[PDB]
Design an enzyme around this catalytic site. Structure first.
Site, PDB file in Angstrom:
ATOM      1  N   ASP A 259      -1.482  32.663   7.516  1.00  0.00           N
ATOM      2  CA  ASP A 259      -1.516  31.775   6.334  1.00  0.00           C
ATOM      3  C   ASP A 259      -1.417  32.602   5.041  1.00  0.00           C
ATOM      4  O   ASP A 259      -2.025  32.279   4.009  1.00  0.00           O
ATOM      5  CB  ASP A 259      -2.808  30.959   6.377  1.00  0.00           C
ATOM      6  CG  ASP A 259      -2.817  29.777   5.389  1.00  0.00           C
ATOM      7  OD1 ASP A 259      -1.733  29.355   4.934  1.00  0.00           O
ATOM      8  OD2 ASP A 259      -3.928  29.247   5.099  1.00  0.00           O
TER       9      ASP A 259
ATOM     10  N   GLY B 154      -9.214  23.374   2.075  1.00  0.00           N
ATOM     11  CA  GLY B 154      -8.217  23.437   3.140  1.00  0.00           C
ATOM     12  C   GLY B 154      -7.889  22.016   3.589  1.00  0.00           C
ATOM     13  O   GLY B 154      -7.876  21.119   2.746  1.00  0.00           O
TER      14      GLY B 154
ATOM     15  N   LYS C  76     -18.315  28.924   2.098  1.00  0.00           N
ATOM     16  CA  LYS C  76     -17.313  28.127   2.793  1.00  0.00           C
ATOM     17  C   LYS C  76     -17.964  27.216   3.801  1.00  0.00           C
ATOM     18  O   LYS C  76     -18.830  27.655   4.579  1.00  0.00           O
ATOM     19  CB  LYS C  76     -16.295  29.023   3.542  1.00  0.00           C
ATOM     20  CG  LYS C  76     -15.198  28.228   4.307  1.00  0.00           C
ATOM     21  CD  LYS C  76     -13.949  29.099   4.589  1.00  0.00           C
ATOM     22  CE  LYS C  76     -12.781  28.242   5.129  1.00  0.00           C
ATOM     23  NZ  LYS C  76     -11.566  29.090   5.557  1.00  0.00           N
TER      24      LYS C  76
ATOM     25  N   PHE D 230      -9.616  21.559   6.491  1.00  0.00           N
ATOM     26  CA  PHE D 230     -10.836  21.287   7.254  1.00  0.00           C
ATOM     27  C   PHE D 230     -11.987  22.143   6.734  1.00  0.00           C
ATOM     28  O   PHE D 230     -13.092  22.138   7.274  1.00  0.00           O
ATOM     29  CB  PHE D 230     -10.611  21.556   8.743  1.00  0.00           C
ATOM     30  CG  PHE D 230      -9.377  20.902   9.296  1.00  0.00           C
ATOM     31  CD1 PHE D 230      -9.228  19.526   9.254  1.00  0.00           C
ATOM     32  CD2 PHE D 230      -8.366  21.663   9.858  1.00  0.00           C
ATOM     33  CE1 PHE D 230      -8.094  18.921   9.762  1.00  0.00           C
ATOM     34  CE2 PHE D 230      -7.229  21.064  10.368  1.00  0.00           C
ATOM     35  CZ  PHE D 230      -7.093  19.690  10.320  1.00  0.00           C
ATOM     36  N   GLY D 231     -11.690  22.871   5.667  1.00  0.00           N
ATOM     37  CA  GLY D 231     -12.634  23.727   4.950  1.00  0.00           C
ATOM     38  C   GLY D 231     -12.717  23.487   3.450  1.00  0.00           C
ATOM     39  O   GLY D 231     -11.800  22.925   2.839  1.00  0.00           O
ATOM     40  N   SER D 232     -13.823  23.908   2.838  1.00  0.00           N
ATOM     41  CA  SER D 232     -13.869  23.985   1.384  1.00  0.00           C
ATOM     42  C   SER D 232     -14.756  25.171   0.993  1.00  0.00           C
ATOM     43  O   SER D 232     -15.641  25.569   1.754  1.00  0.00           O
ATOM     44  CB  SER D 232     -14.302  22.643   0.746  1.00  0.00           C
ATOM     45  OG  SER D 232     -15.697  22.561   0.493  1.00  0.00           O
TER      46      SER D 232
HETATM   47  N1  LIG Z   1     -11.320  26.151   2.542  1.00  0.00           N
HETATM   48  C1  LIG Z   1     -10.695  26.854   1.884  1.00  0.00           C
HETATM   49  C2  LIG Z   1      -9.776  27.600   1.030  1.00  0.00           C
HETATM   50  C3  LIG Z   1     -10.434  27.825  -0.403  1.00  0.00           C
HETATM   51  O1  LIG Z   1     -11.377  27.126  -0.758  1.00  0.00           O
HETATM   52  N2  LIG Z   1      -9.959  28.818  -1.181  1.00  0.00           N
HETATM   53  C4  LIG Z   1      -8.858  29.670  -0.745  1.00  0.00           C
HETATM   54  C5  LIG Z   1      -9.341  31.097  -0.562  1.00  0.00           C
HETATM   55  C6  LIG Z   1      -9.993  31.602  -1.849  1.00  0.00           C
HETATM   56  C7  LIG Z   1     -11.011  30.598  -2.380  1.00  0.00           C
HETATM   57  N3  LIG Z   1     -11.554  31.027  -3.663  1.00  0.00           N
HETATM   58  C8  LIG Z   1     -11.200  30.675  -4.948  1.00  0.00           C
HETATM   59  N4  LIG Z   1     -11.854  31.343  -5.870  1.00  0.00           N
HETATM   60  C9  LIG Z   1     -12.700  32.186  -5.153  1.00  0.00           C
HETATM   61  C10 LIG Z   1     -13.591  33.161  -5.586  1.00  0.00           C
HETATM   62  N5  LIG Z   1     -14.295  33.931  -4.748  1.00  0.00           N
HETATM   63  C11 LIG Z   1     -14.131  33.726  -3.429  1.00  0.00           C
HETATM   64  N6  LIG Z   1     -14.759  34.395  -2.419  1.00  0.00           N
HETATM   65  C12 LIG Z   1     -14.349  33.883  -1.219  1.00  0.00           C
HETATM   66  C13 LIG Z   1     -13.437  32.895  -1.424  1.00  0.00           C
HETATM   67  C14 LIG Z   1     -13.271  32.753  -2.843  1.00  0.00           C
HETATM   68  C15 LIG Z   1     -12.543  31.996  -3.754  1.00  0.00           C
HETATM   69  C16 LIG Z   1     -10.488  29.190  -2.496  1.00  0.00           C
END
Ligand SMILES: N#CCC(=O)N1CCC[C@@H](n2cnc3cnc4[nH]ccc4c32)C1
Length: 288
Positions: free
Chosen positions: A132, A19, A43, A21-23
């Site tokens: 979002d 994001g 997260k 402010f997130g990852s």
């Molecule tokens: N911070 C932030 C956003 C992020 O990192 N994302 C967006 C939302 C989905 C995210 N994501 C991408 N591949 C994923 C697989 N499993 C997931 N479970 C929760 C989230 C998740 C997964 C990546």
């Protein structure tokens, strides 16, 4: 109580996203240290402000309160506050569609669209505004099922009002935003409907880069467009009924649903329940 995950047992596999402010990272939770634990998604704040901490605590409480086939599952927390979620192995619907577009037909996009509407209706039921909605925030659990997969900007409506006014620091996904979100910072179920219209547009362009909302809007506004004025020009464009074009191959009935989501009159946009009904009727009809 949430089977609190110990940090020392979380093994990093790779980053999934950022994001904002997130990852989110892919990790293996391996408490027996014998390489038999499940892989989970974790997260965390990419820079842990105490204000961002508060928002994160609220995000966690939101996801925790949500239980639905089309909402990513909460698993617990690890505390350095981390949110543990199920890992969906197909990743985001955005990347999935980009890489499998020759395998994913219209009937299949409508199945996903329907599932997204059901997830969103469930949120509205809790007076949650997502804020979002975008294909990069939808996850693919398997070929037949998607889930809303991130809640970083999600807000609860005040008790006495049908919109929530909020202005955040730095960068917004303005090309997914309803006019009244751009002009007045107002977010509501109806602005989620506007953004859902943009998700549907994304799906039917199959994430073609030159067709993305930013590229198309930028092209309509002019790329002599200098960034602060962009929002001002975007506002003017929408006000004069500038709209994303119908994607290549998209039926009129599907484009009509998009265009109805993109009504300037907030109260005239369809409900998520009507959206599901209409999408499901077009599905049943495309059967034969
Ligand atoms: N911070 C932030 C956003 C992020 O990192 N994302 C967006 C939302 C989905 C995210 N994501 C991408 N591949 C994923 C697989 N499993 C997931 N479970 C929760 C989230 C998740 C997964 C990546």
């Amino acid at each position: 109580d949430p089977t609190q995950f110990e940090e020392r047992h979380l093994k990093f596999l790779r980053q999934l996203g950022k994001g904002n402010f997130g990852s989110v990272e892919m990790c293996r939770y391996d408490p027996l240290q014998d390489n038999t634990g499940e892989v989970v998604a974790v997260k965390k704040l990419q820079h842990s402000t105490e204000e961002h901490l508060r928002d994160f605590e609220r995000e966690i409480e939101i996801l925790k309160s949500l239980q639905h086939d089309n909402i990513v599952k909460y698993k617990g927390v690890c505390y350095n506050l981390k949110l543990i979620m199920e890992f969906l192995p197909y990743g985001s619907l955005r990347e999935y569609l980009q890489k499998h577009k020759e395998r994913i037909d219209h009937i299949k996009l409508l199945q996903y669209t329907s599932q997204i509407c059901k997830g969103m209706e469930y949120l509205g039921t809790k007076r949650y505004i997502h804020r979002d909605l975008a294909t990069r925030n939808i996850l693919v659990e398997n070929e037949n099922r998607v889930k809303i997969g991130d809640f970083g900007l999600t807000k609860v409506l005040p008790q006495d009002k049908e919109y929530y006014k909020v202005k955040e620091p730095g960068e917004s996904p303005i090309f997914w935003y309803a006019p009244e979100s751009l002009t007045e910072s107002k977010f509501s179920v109806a602005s989620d409907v506007w953004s859902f219209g943009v998700v549907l547009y994304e799906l039917f362009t199959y994430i073609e880069k030159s067709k993305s909302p930013p590229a198309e809007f930028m092209r309509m506004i002019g790329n002599d467009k200098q960034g602060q004025m962009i929002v001002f020009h975007l506002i003017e464009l929408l006000k004069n009924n500038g709209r994303l074009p119908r994607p290549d191959g998209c039926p009129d009935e599907i484009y009509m649903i998009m265009t109805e989501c993109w009504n300037n009159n907030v109260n005239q946009r369809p409900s998520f329940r009507d959206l599901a009904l209409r999408v499901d009727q077009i599905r049943d009809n495309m059967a034969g």
